[PDB]
Structure formats: structure tokens, C-alpha cells
Design a protein around this ligand. Structure first.
Ligand code: WOK
Ligand code: WOK
Lengths: 306, 306
């Protein structure tokens, strides 16, 4: 038992990180086969990013303006292409440490691991969720751009995020590995707002199930409720509406605990309406919404990868 | 900014994990140079662990009773030695993926990363602290024994923990890489209590500093206090006493924020005495004590390793 925010093992991604320099700007890139991916604003300078014309900027730029280093070793760039908000640099050496991999665009409420990197070197790894408003609550300093977020499916790495920016509220925004932002963000230094965040209801439920599984059951009450009625209370607290797809996704946890989703919902309604009363659930004094059902299933079944 | 429980990148340890089998018992071992380390109770069976005589058990045991696998590849064991609560199996192949490494016995209040493993394969990585009472609050299922805890200093891996058991309170216990338990625990299935846990005061302060650094400063009051007076309140809440060594260790954070440790202490005293009032600090509704000053320094400066 016990319950921790767990990240995937980062070994397979660590071998893919490199440093990309264009003039004085340095950030991280991702080296897969003979291609390096990084944010296109590597080609901008720190003090003129208010509203870049990326096309014009990129036009002063040749293959040789791009310094790519993997550890000590410099790579030769033989080709460059802009794709949405990402630059792709063709290099002359396939990464010998390339994992099996794909590129996926994740959905709001899914989780993934971030390998936070500086100057192309790994600093740390943590787990994050794509919020409903397509931000993440990461931990990212200057130099972190180009750090990636991923999942591991057995031996396969699914890359889903590349870091680009921090928004005024101190949350973070970025793209998929095709260069397309999650959310309405753009890669210029301008005031940009995320909308209202909402709680990922299905995640909160999974976490309530994990609680039960771990023996923490104080909050289970003696009521049940309806989807419709639950959803009336959900909406008022800025919880995402629960659908029957959510109910069915929780099926394993439901089955494993013997507690029907709508019972667990009733418990949740009371926690929403009366707060925790200074108690904790799995050591937390707030309702956690950054574990998917899938996450909970695996931390309570021991899923492995390498 | 932002503030996350961050683990070290796990790549260098992932290449060291193997599966160790003795009869029907399987757990994880750590393969460094030509030696595999694992818990000695790999030689016991699931249902007779009430009070093993490890010496007698080990005596029915020969090199060939030990099945060591690294992925598909079986390793040949040419020698075995019991050291305290660990078994050391000499193998005929040096791990080609051995990192630079040392073995350290950590102190209560230090943090480290855990690579939780099953059947010799990595499942996940998270950060943990050695509690004052020498437990950890991990996330560990059946099969997790032999998973290790570590730090990275630049390119060097310092192994500090090997997992052994879960205690009745749902916390976890284990040894250093020499086989010596942290705390008064022993490797038999018997009711065993950890004493009272205490909060790691210096960590809570570092986390208050991280809060300030991130712009979350609501809790800063207009008082100061004395070590002595602070310590009077500390003791009543089961906080570890703060010493001048602690004060001096917080020096970087102190200097970087302009807030003297004893001011921050005064703020902490009020939080202890009046609670948070339903507010949060770095998104938490409790006082976090699992980040060292060192941890905070690095998540707020971008320390890298590979
Ligand atoms: C990342 O590492 C990058 N740094 C640089 C430096 C250059 F010189 C060129 C290109 C890049 S990308 C930055 C990561 C953030 C630093 C602080 N926390 C981080 O996550 N990303 C940026 O600095 C990013 C780039 C320009 C302005 N950025 C921002 O993140 C800024 N935010 C915003 O303007 C907004 F809209 F509020 F989000 C800011 C104020 C620096 C935090 C661009 C968006 C291209
Ligand atoms: C680990 O993976 C191991 N499993 C086995 C299985 C065998 F057949 C032989 C040896 C081993 S070591 C176990 C990890 C725990 C399982 C549940 N959560 C875990 O962290 N470790 C043990 O099962 C451990 C070993 C015997 C009894 N152990 C306990 O952890 C038990 N706790 C206690 O008895 C005490 F004192 F309360 F702590 C228990 C009740 C199974 C959780 C020994 C201590 C050698």
C-alpha cells in the first residue's frame, strides 16, 4: 500500500535529450532517429519575443547556425524545417539510444511524466496532468524549454508534450511533438490567460478508490445519488461532469472494492459540500485529481515496463 | 517557478536492476560490477517468516539455487555471502551498465529517490524522506523488496536504501546497502512498531522559503522569535528541535529571500498555533516536510546531472 505521485522511469528519454543553441539562446531538444525536435523560438533572442515573425527570423537562419550537442559530441545539422511551433533539425547521426516511440496528442485529464532538463541535461522527473484548460502545473525554470512529457507503454515511449512557457498564473503551457499547442496559447511574450480550471472528477473518484483500497475509508457515507444529481453539485464546484464512460472506466476499481460509482459519488458530494473537517485522505487535506483510473490501477497492481 | 516533488532521473539505476529467485520466492536485486545485492529473505518462503534462522536456512543453499536474470539473460552465481540483512551473490559477469556509485547511510530528514521495481523491472520513480523514526512513506506492493533508494551527485549514484517491509501503520522499512536496518526493525514477520514520528522542522522552513520564492507569501507575519522560544512550540507539536546548524544550512534561502530564519520561524509558529485557515501554500493544505534545503535550492536553481 501507500500512495505516491509516481513518475515513469526516465532512462529511455534521458538518452534522447540534447542541447540546441542558436546564437546566445540555448534550450533542450529531443533526438530521435536522425531528427532533433525543439521549440522554434530557439531562433529568437531573450529581449525581443513580444511578437516574433518566425518565418522572417527563420529565413536569416542556415543549417550551420544551429549548434546541437549530445554531451561533448557536436552533431552536424543537414536540414531544418519549421512545423507549427517546433523546429525539426535533420542531423547526420541517428541516435543509437532511440527507444521505440510514438507521438500522441493527449486529452485533458490524462497524466504523464516530465523529465525536466537544463542545457540538454536531466535535472528531475515528476508526474503531471493535462488540466481541463490545457495547462499543466509543472516545475520549470529558465532553460527548461524543450523538456518533454511522456508515457511508457511496456517498451514504447509515447511523447505527448514539449515545454514552451509559463503563464501569468504560474502554470505552464506547451505543445505536442508536432508543434501544436495544447490550449489557445501562442509562443510570444504577451499577456495570455488560461480560462477557469475545473477539477477532473473521474480522477478524484479513482483517488477515492485508491484510498479505500489502502484502508482509508472514513469518508464513505451511507447514501447514493444519481448521475444527474451528482452532476448538479459537480457543476457548482467547477468539477467536470461525470458521464457513463467515466463510470465504465472506473469499473475495475468499482469491482475491486465492491463500491458502486454512484455510492462513491455520494461520498464525494458530501466532501464537496462539508469539506474534510481537518481530516486527511491518503495523507492529503485536499481532493487529488491528478491520478487517472489507469494510474490508480497500476500503483495498486504493480505494472512494469523495462 | 511551480513546485513539485521531483525525483532524480532513474536511467543510471534502471540499468542495475535484476530479478533474483530462490525456489518460489522472487525479488529484485541490484547488479553492480560482478556482485548482486538483495534482501537475504529471498531464501525464505512466503508462509514461514515468523522467525527465520537465516544462518540455518542459508546453509541448505548453494550457488546454483540462486536464479539471477537480467532481462532474458541468466547470470551464473559463483559465490554467496550474507552481510547483515542482505545477500551478496558474486556473478561471473560485471554489469556493463554499472554507473559510478557509492554506498551511503543517510541521516533522518534527508530525501532520496525510489525506483519501485517488480520482478526486476522498473515500475515507477518517486521522492521520499527518511523520517526521524527511520521509516519511509513509500508506495510498495508485494514483489517490491530489493527496490532501491538513491541520490545522484553529478554522475555519481549514491545508494542509500533497499526495501524490505511494510509496518502495521502502512509505512515502510529497509536497510542500507550493507544490510543494516534504518531504525530498530528486523526482517521477520512479527508485530513491530515505529515510535512517534516528528516533523522535520528544517525541511518545513525550506518549503516556506520555496513558497516565498514562488510569490506565495500570505503567511509571512510581522513577528520574530528566539530559537529557544520557537523550540518550546516546536516540541509541543512533535517538531524536531531547530539548531544553529539548521539555521546556517538555510543560509542560502535566507540570503536569497531576505527573510531571517527566526522571522520565518515566527510565521511557522503561527501556522502551527492557528492552522492554515483553509488556505494553501504551494497548493498544499498541510505543512510539507519532505523537501530539504538542498532540494529547494536545486528546484529553484536548476541543478543537472547527466
Ligand atoms: C524557456 O525555457 C525558454 N526560454 C527561452 C529563452 C530565449 F532566449 C528564447 C527562447 C526561449 S524558450 C522558457 C520557460 C519559462 C521561463 C520561466 N518559466 C518557464 O517555464 N519559456 C519562455 O521564456 C517563454 C518564451 C517567451 C516568453 N516565455 C514565457 O514563458 C513568458 N510567459 C509569457 O509571456 C506568457 F504569455 F505570459 F505566458 C515569461 C514571462 C518569460 C514567463 C516565449 C513564449 C516564446
Ligand atoms: C517484499 O517484497 C518481500 N516479499 C517477500 C516474499 C517472500 F516470499 C519472501 C521474502 C519476501 S521480501 C515485501 C514488501 C511488502 C509487501 C507488502 N508491502 C511491502 O512493502 N516484504 C515483506 O513481505 C516482509 C518480509 C516478511 C514479512 N514482511 C512484511 O513486509 C510484513 N510486515 C511485517 O511483518 C511487519 F513487522 F509488520 F512489518 C507484511 C505483514 C507482509 C506487510 C519479512 C519482514 C522478511
Amino acid at each position: 500500500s501507500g500512495f505516491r505521485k509516481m513518475a515513469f522511469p526516465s532512462g529511455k528519454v534521458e538518452g534522447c535529450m540534447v542541447q540546441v543553441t542558436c546564437g546566445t539562446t540555448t534550450l533542450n531538444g529531443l533526438w530521435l532517429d536522425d531528427v532533433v525536435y525543439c521549440p522554434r523560438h530557439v531562433i529568437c533572442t531573450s529581449e525581443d519575443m513580444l511578437n516574433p515573425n518566425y518565418e522572417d527570423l527563420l529565413i536569416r537562419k542556415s543549417n550551420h547556425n544551429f549548434l546541437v550537442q549530445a554531451g561533448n559530441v557536436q552533431l552536424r545539422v543537414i536540414g531544418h524545417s519549421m512545423q507549427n511551433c517546433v523546429l525539426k533539425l535533420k542531423v547526420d547521426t541517428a541516435n543509437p539510444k532511440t527507444p521505440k516511440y510514438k507521438f500522441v496528442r493527449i486529452q485533458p485529464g490524462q497524466t504523464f511524466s516530465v523529465l525536466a532538463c537544463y542545457n540538454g541535461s536531466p535535472s528531475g522527473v515528476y508526474q503531471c496532468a493535462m488540466r481541463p484548460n490545457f495547462t499543466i502545473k509543472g516545475s520549470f525554470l529558465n532553460g527548461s524549454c524543450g523538456s518533454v512529457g511522456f508515457n511508457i507503454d511496456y517498451d514504447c515511449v509515447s511523447f505527448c508534450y514539449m515545454h514552451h512557457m509559463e503563464l501569468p498564473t504560474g502554470v505552464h503551457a506547451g505543445t505536442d511533438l508536432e508543434g501544436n499547442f495544447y490550449g489557445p496559447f501562442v509562443d510570444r511574450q504577451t499577456a495570455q490567460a488560461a480560462g477557469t480550471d475545473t477539477t477532473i472528477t473521474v480522477n478524484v473518484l479513482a483517488w477515492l478508490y485508491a484510498a479505500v483500497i489502502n484502508g482509508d475509508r472514513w469518508f464513505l457515507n451511507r447514501f447514493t445519488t444519481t448521475l444527474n444529481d451528482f452532476n448538479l453539485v459537480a457543476m457548482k464546484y467547477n468539477y467536470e461532469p461525470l458521464t457513463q464512460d467515466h463510470v465504465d472506466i472506473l469499473g475495475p476499481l468499482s469491482a475491486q472494492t465492491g463500491i458502486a460509482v454512484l455510492d462513491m459519488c455520494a461520498s464525494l458530494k458530501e466532501l464537496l459540500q462539508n469539506g474534510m473537517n481537518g481530516r486527511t485522505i491518503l495523507g492529503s487535506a485536499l481532493l487529488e485529481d491528478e491520478f487517472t483510473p489507469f494510474d490508480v490501477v497500476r500503483q495498486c497492481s504493480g505494472v512494469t515496463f523495462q
